[PDB]
Motif scaffolding. Structure first.
Motif, PDB file in Angstrom:
ATOM      1  N   UNK A  92       0.873  -1.201  -0.041  1.00  0.00           N
ATOM      2  CA  UNK A  92       0.248  -0.014   0.211  1.00  0.00           C
ATOM      3  C   UNK A  92       0.861   1.316  -0.221  1.00  0.00           C
ATOM      4  N   UNK A  93       2.102   1.177   0.663  1.00  0.00           N
ATOM      5  CA  UNK A  93       2.884   2.424   0.736  1.00  0.00           C
ATOM      6  C   UNK A  93       3.514   2.560  -0.379  1.00  0.00           C
ATOM      7  N   UNK A  94       3.382   1.831  -1.461  1.00  0.00           N
ATOM      8  CA  UNK A  94       4.139   1.797  -2.766  1.00  0.00           C
ATOM      9  C   UNK A  94       3.058   2.812  -3.501  1.00  0.00           C
ATOM     10  N   UNK A  95       1.667   2.798  -3.369  1.00  0.00           N
ATOM     11  CA  UNK A  95       0.970   3.852  -3.880  1.00  0.00           C
ATOM     12  C   UNK A  95       1.174   5.244  -3.335  1.00  0.00           C
ATOM     13  N   UNK A  96       1.163   5.498  -2.140  1.00  0.00           N
ATOM     14  CA  UNK A  96       1.399   6.714  -1.823  1.00  0.00           C
ATOM     15  C   UNK A  96       2.615   7.299  -1.658  1.00  0.00           C
ATOM     16  N   UNK A  97       3.693   6.334  -1.706  1.00  0.00           N
ATOM     17  CA  UNK A  97       5.269   6.759  -1.895  1.00  0.00           C
ATOM     18  C   UNK A  97       5.295   7.068  -3.294  1.00  0.00           C
ATOM     19  N   UNK A  98       4.824   6.326  -4.177  1.00  0.00           N
ATOM     20  CA  UNK A  98       5.082   6.600  -5.553  1.00  0.00           C
ATOM     21  C   UNK A  98       4.462   8.054  -5.821  1.00  0.00           C
ATOM     22  N   UNK A 140       0.523   7.702  -9.393  1.00  0.00           N
ATOM     23  CA  UNK A 140       0.240   6.208  -8.926  1.00  0.00           C
ATOM     24  C   UNK A 140       0.855   5.229 -10.067  1.00  0.00           C
ATOM     25  N   UNK A 141       1.536   5.710 -10.957  1.00  0.00           N
ATOM     26  CA  UNK A 141       2.033   4.923 -12.175  1.00  0.00           C
ATOM     27  C   UNK A 141       3.511   4.297 -11.713  1.00  0.00           C
ATOM     28  N   UNK A 142       3.758   3.320 -12.463  1.00  0.00           N
ATOM     29  CA  UNK A 142       5.349   2.820 -12.524  1.00  0.00           C
ATOM     30  C   UNK A 142       5.180   1.601 -13.468  1.00  0.00           C
ATOM     31  N   UNK A 143       5.707   1.935 -14.971  1.00  0.00           N
ATOM     32  CA  UNK A 143       5.778   0.857 -15.687  1.00  0.00           C
ATOM     33  C   UNK A 143       6.121   1.546 -17.011  1.00  0.00           C
ATOM     34  N   UNK A 144       5.323   2.931 -17.465  1.00  0.00           N
ATOM     35  CA  UNK A 144       5.588   3.553 -18.531  1.00  0.00           C
ATOM     36  C   UNK A 144       6.919   4.538 -18.413  1.00  0.00           C
ATOM     37  N   UNK A 145       6.653   5.932 -18.154  1.00  0.00           N
ATOM     38  CA  UNK A 145       7.568   6.702 -18.041  1.00  0.00           C
ATOM     39  C   UNK A 145       8.311   6.769 -16.555  1.00  0.00           C
ATOM     40  N   UNK A 146       7.154   6.426 -15.575  1.00  0.00           N
ATOM     41  CA  UNK A 146       7.671   6.596 -14.224  1.00  0.00           C
ATOM     42  C   UNK A 146       8.944   5.598 -14.054  1.00  0.00           C
ATOM     43  N   UNK A 147       8.673   4.330 -14.628  1.00  0.00           N
ATOM     44  CA  UNK A 147       9.452   3.275 -14.581  1.00  0.00           C
ATOM     45  C   UNK A 147      10.863   3.601 -15.322  1.00  0.00           C
ATOM     46  N   UNK A 148      10.762   4.213 -16.584  1.00  0.00           N
ATOM     47  CA  UNK A 148      11.927   4.284 -17.276  1.00  0.00           C
ATOM     48  C   UNK A 148      12.811   5.346 -16.590  1.00  0.00           C
ATOM     49  N   UNK A 149      12.303   6.308 -15.904  1.00  0.00           N
ATOM     50  CA  UNK A 149      13.196   7.278 -15.131  1.00  0.00           C
ATOM     51  C   UNK A 149      13.785   6.743 -14.070  1.00  0.00           C
ATOM     52  N   UNK A 150      13.060   5.673 -13.509  1.00  0.00           N
ATOM     53  CA  UNK A 150      13.543   4.949 -12.391  1.00  0.00           C
ATOM     54  C   UNK A 150      14.794   4.190 -12.773  1.00  0.00           C
ATOM     55  N   UNK A 151      14.971   3.724 -13.907  1.00  0.00           N
ATOM     56  CA  UNK A 151      16.062   2.946 -14.652  1.00  0.00           C
ATOM     57  C   UNK A 151      17.129   3.725 -15.221  1.00  0.00           C
ATOM     58  N   UNK A 152      16.794   5.118 -15.591  1.00  0.00           N
ATOM     59  CA  UNK A 152      17.572   6.071 -16.246  1.00  0.00           C
ATOM     60  C   UNK A 152      18.357   6.826 -15.056  1.00  0.00           C
ATOM     61  N   UNK A 153      19.630   7.212 -15.374  1.00  0.00           N
ATOM     62  CA  UNK A 153      20.518   8.176 -14.745  1.00  0.00           C
ATOM     63  C   UNK A 153      20.055   9.198 -14.303  1.00  0.00           C
ATOM     64  N   UNK A 154      20.615  10.145 -13.245  1.00  0.00           N
ATOM     65  CA  UNK A 154      19.999  11.400 -12.927  1.00  0.00           C
ATOM     66  C   UNK A 154      20.944  12.013 -11.889  1.00  0.00           C
ATOM     67  N   UNK A 155      20.966  11.745 -10.721  1.00  0.00           N
ATOM     68  CA  UNK A 155      21.854  12.172  -9.604  1.00  0.00           C
ATOM     69  C   UNK A 155      22.050  11.127  -8.791  1.00  0.00           C
ATOM     70  N   UNK A 156      23.062  11.481  -7.870  1.00  0.00           N
ATOM     71  CA  UNK A 156      23.305  10.420  -6.721  1.00  0.00           C
ATOM     72  C   UNK A 156      22.969  11.120  -5.500  1.00  0.00           C
ATOM     73  N   UNK A 157      22.006  12.084  -5.604  1.00  0.00           N
ATOM     74  CA  UNK A 157      21.733  12.836  -4.208  1.00  0.00           C
ATOM     75  C   UNK A 157      20.184  12.654  -4.057  1.00  0.00           C
ATOM     76  N   UNK A 158      19.680  12.290  -2.823  1.00  0.00           N
ATOM     77  CA  UNK A 158      18.435  12.157  -2.264  1.00  0.00           C
ATOM     78  C   UNK A 158      17.394  13.489  -2.709  1.00  0.00           C
ATOM     79  N   UNK A 159      16.320  13.145  -2.171  1.00  0.00           N
ATOM     80  CA  UNK A 159      15.491  14.554  -2.436  1.00  0.00           C
ATOM     81  C   UNK A 159      14.769  14.963  -1.195  1.00  0.00           C
TER      82      UNK A 159
END
Ligand SMILES: [Ca+2]
Ligand SMILES: [Ca+2]
Ligand SMILES: [Zn+2]
Ligand SMILES: [Zn+2]
Length: 250
Positions: free
Chosen positions: A36-42, A55-74
């Motif tokens: 459940x925390x996945x929906x809220x957290x996501x 609440x998405x995770x497979x299209x563009x949301x998943x792409x960015x997760x696998x794609x590089x960006x920064x090594x610092x948290x939010x």
């Protein structure tokens, strides 16, 4: 633009990794481990990235997760030594600690200033050149095993970890020497484009939800030679340094 769909046929490992990937991009919370925390957290991640699809995770949301960006948290939280989140000093100094065989010390040193300078030119602050002594923001290369927390991870996930404006030792700039840095080669993470996002972290700035923000986590697209600071980016810092005009969170 393109928009494939490989996530649909991805393995459980790929889908499970996304859950942990978003965790490292924020903080160390093993208590949030839940379906459940996945929906809220996501959902919270959607606002940080700026993407509409919630609440998405497979299209563009998943792409960015696998794609590089920064090594610092939010999200951070470690005492409140330094006044205010962003730089509160009257002058900012930077000095390169080392250079990568990928580029000359001159190209790397000049690159940092090319992006670090743009940040100052967009604020009433002030920057100073280093020629004698130590600087506030140190620009050096190293891996997660250089003496800091979090594993190097190597190539891919995690681009570079930046420190906030705190104390003298803190507020330095780091880069994953394991990554691909270059300019005239434009093959990996452009030092110029990465510098702006990395340098901005030292100023306390935060990622923007704007599709044309310089701190955009979805870094990766047509990068013009005139690429500079973003509108929402400059207006965001101007609201804390100068006057505001309807902005968003970091
Ligand atoms: Ca990496
Ligand atoms: Ca420092
Ligand atoms: Zn970042
Ligand atoms: Zn480090």
């Amino acid at each position: 633009l393109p928009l494939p769909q490989e996530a649909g046929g991805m393995s459980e490992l790929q889908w499970e990794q996304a859950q942990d990937y978003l965790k490292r991009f924020y903080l160390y919370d093993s208590e949030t481990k839940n379906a459940n925390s996945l929906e809220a957290k996501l959902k919270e991640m959607q606002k940080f990235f700026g993407l509409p699809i919630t609440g998405m995770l497979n299209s563009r949301v998943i792409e960015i997760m696998q794609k590089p960006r920064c090594g610092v948290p939010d999200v951070a939280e470690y005492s409140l030594f330094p006044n205010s989140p962003k730089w509160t000093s009257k002058v900012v100094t930077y000095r390169i600690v080392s250079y990568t065989r990928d580029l000359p010390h001159i190209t790397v040193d000049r690159l940092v200033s090319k992006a670090l300078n743009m940040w100052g030119k967009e604020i009433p602050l002030h920057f100073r050149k280093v020629v004698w002594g130590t600087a506030d923001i140190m620009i050096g290369f190293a891996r997660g095993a250089h003496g800091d927390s979090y594993p190097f991870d190597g190539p891919g996930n995690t681009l570079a970890h930046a420190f906030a404006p705190g104390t003298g030792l803190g507020g330095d700039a780091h880069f994953d020497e394991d990554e691909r840095w270059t300019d005239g080669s434009s093959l990996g993470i452009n030092f110029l484009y990465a510098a702006t996002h990395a340098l901005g972290h030292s100023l306390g700035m935060g990622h923007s939800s704007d599709p044309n923000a310089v701190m955009y986590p979805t870094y990766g697209n047509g990068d013009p030679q005139n690429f500079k600071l973003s509108q929402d980016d400059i207006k965001g810092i101007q609201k804390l340094y100068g006057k505001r005009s309807n902005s968003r969170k970091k």
